[PDB]
Design an enzyme around this catalytic site. Structure first.
Site, PDB file in Angstrom:
ATOM      1  N   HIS A 136       0.625  -1.306   0.337  1.00 36.59           N
ATOM      2  CA  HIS A 136      -0.004  -0.149  -0.056  1.00 36.59           C
ATOM      3  C   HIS A 136       0.932   1.278   0.082  1.00 36.59           C
ATOM      4  O   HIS A 136       0.247   2.271  -0.279  1.00 36.59           O
ATOM      5  CB  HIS A 136      -1.194   0.036   1.120  1.00 36.59           C
ATOM      6  CG  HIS A 136      -0.574   0.412   2.407  1.00 36.59           C
ATOM      7  ND1 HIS A 136      -0.574  -0.462   3.351  1.00 36.59           N
ATOM      8  CD2 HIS A 136      -0.319   1.597   3.108  1.00 36.59           C
ATOM      9  CE1 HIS A 136       0.022   0.164   4.739  1.00 36.59           C
ATOM     10  NE2 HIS A 136      -0.135   1.316   4.426  1.00 36.59           N
ATOM     11  N   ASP A 151       0.102  -7.494   1.624  1.00 32.46           N
ATOM     12  CA  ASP A 151       0.286  -6.099   1.587  1.00 32.46           C
ATOM     13  C   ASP A 151       1.923  -6.077   1.759  1.00 32.46           C
ATOM     14  O   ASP A 151       2.417  -5.898   2.772  1.00 32.46           O
ATOM     15  CB  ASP A 151      -0.441  -5.397   2.854  1.00 32.46           C
ATOM     16  CG  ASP A 151      -0.242  -3.921   2.788  1.00 32.46           C
ATOM     17  OD1 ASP A 151       0.209  -3.382   1.710  1.00 32.46           O
ATOM     18  OD2 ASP A 151      -0.480  -3.156   3.911  1.00 32.46           O
ATOM     19  N   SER A 210       4.001   2.196   8.127  1.00 31.74           N
ATOM     20  CA  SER A 210       3.553   0.865   7.218  1.00 31.74           C
ATOM     21  C   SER A 210       4.938   0.432   6.621  1.00 31.74           C
ATOM     22  O   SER A 210       5.645   1.225   6.282  1.00 31.74           O
ATOM     23  CB  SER A 210       2.578   0.927   6.208  1.00 31.74           C
ATOM     24  OG  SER A 210       1.397   1.200   7.215  1.00 31.74           O
TER      25      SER A 210
HETATM   26  C1  LIG Z   1      -4.571   3.553   9.414  1.00 33.80           C
HETATM   27  C2  LIG Z   1      -3.076   3.138   9.210  1.00 33.80           C
HETATM   28  C3  LIG Z   1      -2.263   3.397   8.025  1.00 33.80           C
HETATM   29  C4  LIG Z   1      -2.497   3.880   6.689  1.00 33.80           C
HETATM   30  C5  LIG Z   1      -1.783   4.979   6.351  1.00 33.80           C
HETATM   31  C6  LIG Z   1      -0.303   4.857   6.059  1.00 33.80           C
HETATM   32  O1  LIG Z   1       0.111   3.901   5.765  1.00 33.80           O
HETATM   33  C7  LIG Z   1       0.317   6.290   5.796  1.00 33.80           C
HETATM   34  C8  LIG Z   1       0.774   6.625   4.375  1.00 33.80           C
HETATM   35  C9  LIG Z   1      -0.354   6.225   3.265  1.00 33.80           C
HETATM   36  C10 LIG Z   1      -1.671   7.064   3.315  1.00 33.80           C
HETATM   37  C11 LIG Z   1      -2.510   6.836   2.250  1.00 33.80           C
HETATM   38  C12 LIG Z   1      -2.245   5.867   1.398  1.00 33.80           C
HETATM   39  C13 LIG Z   1      -1.223   4.753   1.426  1.00 33.80           C
HETATM   40  C14 LIG Z   1      -0.340   5.193   2.323  1.00 33.80           C
HETATM   41  O2  LIG Z   1      -0.678   7.100   6.093  1.00 33.80           O
HETATM   42  C15 LIG Z   1      -1.823   6.316   6.512  1.00 33.80           C
HETATM   43  O3  LIG Z   1      -3.073   7.315   6.631  1.00 33.80           O
HETATM   44  C16 LIG Z   1      -2.978   3.175   5.588  1.00 33.80           C
HETATM   45  C17 LIG Z   1      -3.146   3.622   4.428  1.00 33.80           C
HETATM   46  C18 LIG Z   1      -3.638   2.562   3.422  1.00 33.80           C
HETATM   47  C19 LIG Z   1      -3.646   1.301   3.565  1.00 33.80           C
HETATM   48  C20 LIG Z   1      -3.396   0.752   4.765  1.00 33.80           C
HETATM   49  C21 LIG Z   1      -3.056   1.777   5.700  1.00 33.80           C
HETATM   50  N1  LIG Z   1      -1.016   2.634   8.232  1.00 33.80           N
HETATM   51  C22 LIG Z   1      -1.051   2.190   9.652  1.00 33.80           C
HETATM   52  C23 LIG Z   1       0.001   1.471  10.059  1.00 33.80           C
HETATM   53  C24 LIG Z   1      -0.453   0.872  11.622  1.00 33.80           C
HETATM   54  C25 LIG Z   1      -1.380   1.320  11.924  1.00 33.80           C
HETATM   55  F1  LIG Z   1      -1.634   0.768  13.221  1.00 33.80           F
HETATM   56  C26 LIG Z   1      -2.618   1.949  11.357  1.00 33.80           C
HETATM   57  C27 LIG Z   1      -2.414   2.379  10.142  1.00 33.80           C
END
Ligand SMILES: Cc1c([C@@H](C2=C(O)[C@@H](Cc3ccccc3)OC2=O)c2ccccc2)[nH]c2ccc(F)cc12
Ligand SMILES: [Cl-]
Ligand SMILES: [Cl-]
Ligand SMILES: [Cl-]
Ligand SMILES: [Zn+2]
Length: 226
Positions: free
Chosen positions: A45, A89, A182
């Site tokens: 992602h 993922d 992530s």
């Molecule tokens: C909610 C959440 C995330 C989401 C997220 C990112 O990874 C970053 C960058 C990004 C943004 C938008 C799109 C892609 C990347 O900003 C985000 O909003 C996410 C987006 C998309 C898919 C899956 C998760 N990652 C996590 C990791 C551990 C956790 F406990 C919770 C989360």
């Protein structure tokens, strides 16, 4: 990383800071880890139009000689990655050139063993992600010790699957990976067993990590063919 500590600088020399570019919004951020001198493992992602990898970082706002800002030539997203369920993922980034090995930059290769990791033990995850729901990403690399949970602890993630994923973080604590983390590794006894994937928007643990053991054949396939 919520509820963690600042890492000893350069103590996790495989850590990668990813800046993810897309054509229609500003940069997004992920972690990752160097598994070969020209391959970084991360989350699917985190894919984008282009990605920059910074190795050798601690405080990502302060340029230093340990930095290696490396171009990514190609992104290898898992071919079964599903944007709805978030299954599979996982992504490999091939770097244009091989990183230099320094005290601050080195690989974390997998051991030959790919045993299934059961619930119960403590593992550590690192990243530059947000340190709270209403907080920006950390300037410094942070890390936290988290409990591997029984899969029932992640049942509320209706697309969680125990064979594909680890359930990480005791819900009794605030400690967790979060947005911006992530793609970073979960190490158990010094071995990468998970990749940060996703969790709740309110950061309440547990979170869902990709179970690396399941993907070892695919990782090997990409590394041998490229
Ligand atoms: C909610 C959440 C995330 C989401 C997220 C990112 O990874 C970053 C960058 C990004 C943004 C938008 C799109 C892609 C990347 O900003 C985000 O909003 C996410 C987006 C998309 C898919 C899956 C998760 N990652 C996590 C990791 C551990 C956790 F406990 C919770 C989360
Ligand atoms: Cl901790
Ligand atoms: Cl939920
Ligand atoms: Cl560790
Ligand atoms: Zn330094």
């Amino acid at each position: 990383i919520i509820g963690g500590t600042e890492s000893k600088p350069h103590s996790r020399p495989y850590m990668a800071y990813l800046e993810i570019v897309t054509s229609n919004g500003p940069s997004k951020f992920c972690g990752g880890f160097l598994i070969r001198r020209n391959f970084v493992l991360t989350a699917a992602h985190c894919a984008g139009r282009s990605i920059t990898v910074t190795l050798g970082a601690h405080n990502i706002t302060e340029e230093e000689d340990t930095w290696q800002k490396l171009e990514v030539i190609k992104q290898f997203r898992h071919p079964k990655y599903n944007t709805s369920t978030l299954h599979h993922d996982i992504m490999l980034l091939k770097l244009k050139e091989k990183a230099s090995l320094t005290l601050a930059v080195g690989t974390l290769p997998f051991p030959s063993q790919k045993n299934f990791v059961p619930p119960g033990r403590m593992c550590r995850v690192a990243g530059w992600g947000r340190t709270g729901v209403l907080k920006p990403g950390s300037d410094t690399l942070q890390e936290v010790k988290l409990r591997l949970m029984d899969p029932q602890a992640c049942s509320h993630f209706r697309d969680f699957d125990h064979n594909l994923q680890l359930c990480v973080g005791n819900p009794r604590k605030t400690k967790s990976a979060f947005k911006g983390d992530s793609g970073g590794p979960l190490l158990c006894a010094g071995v990468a067993q998970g990749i940060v994937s996703y969790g709740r928007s309110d950061a309440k643990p547990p979170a869902v990590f990709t179970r690396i053991s399941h993907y070892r054949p695919w990782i090997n396939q990409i590394l041998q063919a490229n």
